[PDB]
Every structure is written in C-alpha cells, then in structure tokens.
C-alpha cells in the first residue's frame, strides 16, 4: 500500500511507521530514553530511510520497510531489522525521497574528519550496508548531512572547539564512497568531535556540559574560517562545570531532553536555555538535581 505515514526513530535505535491519520488519533515510571524521538518523517511508504552507522556504512530502507505499529509503541530495533554487523550502530538517519534530493552528502568522523561525496554515488541496491567512508580502527563515523557547494559547515568538539567552514567544490572536493576523509578540524588527543551541521540562518548552537550548564549562541556569531584549522571556543571551560556532552542546533521554539546521570529524561525547551556568547560559560539547567550530572541532550523531533 502507498500511504502517508509518520516515520519515528528513538533516541535508543527503535523505528516505527504509522498512517498519518491514525498517529493524529493515538496518544508510573518516568520519562526514559526509549520516550525519545530522536527522528520524525512524514513521507510516503514507499520514501527513502537512510541509516549511516558509526562504522560509517549506509543501509537503505524504503518506509515501509519499518514495521507498523502504534504512537505509543517503540518499534523494531533498526539494527536488527536492517542485519547491521556486530557491534554496528545508528550514527545518523537522513529521509530523501530521491538520490538527487541535494547535490552532495558530507560525513564527519569522531577523529575530526570530513568527506563529501556526490548522493548519486549511493544509489545502489547493493547487499545491506555500503562503504559511506574508509575509517581507521580508532575513528567513527558521527555525522552525515545533505548540502550543496553553497553551504556552510558547522564541526563541534567535545572539548568546546568550533569551526565553520564554507563547503565549496574547491575547499572539499566531491571524493568517493570508499576513501578516507580530509581534515576538517584539528583538536587534541583527549578531544573528540560532537556533531556535524549544515548552517541555517536564525538557528542557534546549544551547547550543554557535563555539569548541566548550558547556552544557545546566535549562528551568526560563528566565524567563516578555512577548513582544518583548530577554529574557535564555543564555551569558557571549567573542571568544576565539564566538557561538552551535545551540541545541537535549535530554533525559539525547539523542544529537547535532558538525559540525567541519576533522574533519568527531563524535557526542556531550548527557549528555556539562555542566549549568550559564543564564549560564555553556559547557565545550570534549573531542572537539574543538585550533585546529578548532565549525560547529553537530544533533539525532541517530534
């Protein structure tokens, strides 16, 4: 059946597709990570999911390759259902409806890498997983976005470091699937990169430490650089407050979730972060526990 569904992904892996018409309808313990919509679609069954993994392959599913189930139910676990290999997780998952959707698609790694490649060079209906980008054994692949040579790149690392990048042909070249990446910013042994985003206007970077301080920075207040550099602070660093545990961008009216060390899922409202510096130190969540620490933060997609 062709049908319009809403396609919804937690936080912890598990998908699911419902008709549109019926999630409209649907509906002691407290919040859990399972409660989290980390992704939602409206699309079409017979639409694209794909599903880059942190061993930086891509397995592609059509919609209705998710299994059908309720509002309230978590679904299937994609890895599983998509017979991801052992110890393979969900880095990211982009909806298209097509491969020429955008020009290009540009991976990150955890060690600091980029690479673009053509989106064409994935339409492929080739086993499961295809290679998305040549790792080493001590890399993972963390981000996957769609873009054009028009756009700006955003790269955050754990330790508070920031770049922006314009992302033409010129400054990173369409390569191939099965290839190393390219430095796209350099940072030390003990850090690591958080997230990968193209650049929107109006939107802010929130960041949140370990501590439970967090901020929203307007986007304009990150500078163009070239690519590969150390690029700039995106918070005051502090032993007491913690390095960076997410670092997502918002709108006024985004919904999010703080995940506790000792309270477990708290929902908070980036409109409920505080607009700063790029260089501030952030602002104690107030929902927060005294002694309770901040394990990370996620997008409420819905």
Not at 94 to 105: E, F, K, N, S, V
Not at 197 to 210: C, D, F, I, K, P
Not at 244 to 271: H, K, M, N, W
Request: charged residues 25%; aromatic residues 6%.
């Amino acid at each position: 059946a062709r049908e319009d569904v809403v396609v919804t992904i937690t936080e912890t892996g598990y998908a699911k597709r419902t008709k549109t018409d019926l999630y409209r309808s649907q509906k002691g313990a407290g919040l859990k990570q399972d409660d989290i919509v980390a992704h939602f679609f409206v699309c079409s069954t017979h639409d694209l999911i794909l599903f880059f993994t942190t061993q930086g392959r891509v397995y592609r599913a059509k919609a209705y390759d998710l299994p059908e189930a309720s509002r309230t139910a978590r679904g299937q676990h994609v890895a599983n259902l998509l017979a991801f290999q052992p110890e393979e997780r969900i880095a990211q998952v982009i909806q298209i409806r097509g491969y020429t959707d955008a020009p290009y698609l540009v991976l990150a790694t955890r060690n600091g890498l980029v690479k673009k490649s053509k989106l064409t060079d994935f339409d492929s209906n080739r086993s499961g997983g295809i290679v998305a980008v040549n790792l080493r054994d001590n890399d993972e692949l963390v981000g996957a976005v769609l873009c054009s040579a028009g756009d700006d790149l955003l790269l955050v690392s754990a330790n508070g470091q920031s770049i922006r990048f314009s992302a033409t042909d010129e400054a990173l070249r369409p390569m191939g699937r099965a290839t190393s990446g390219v430095q796209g910013m350099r940072f030390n042994i003990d850090d690591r990169l958080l997230s990968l985003n193209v650049v929107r206007e109006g939107t802010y970077l929130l960041v949140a430490t370990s501590g439970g301080y967090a901020k929203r920075t307007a986007i304009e207040e990150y500078p163009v650089q070239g690519r590969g550099g150390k690029g700039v602070l995106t918070v005051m660093y502090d032993r007491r407050r913690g390095r960076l545990v997410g670092a997502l961008i918002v709108d006024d009216d985004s919904e999010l979730y703080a995940v506790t060390s000792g309270g477990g899922v708290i929902r908070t409202a980036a409109r409920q972060v505080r607009k700063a510096g790029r260089q501030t130190k952030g602002v104690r969540l107030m929902n927060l526990g005294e002694g309770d620490t901040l394990l990370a933060i996620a997008r409420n997609a819905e």
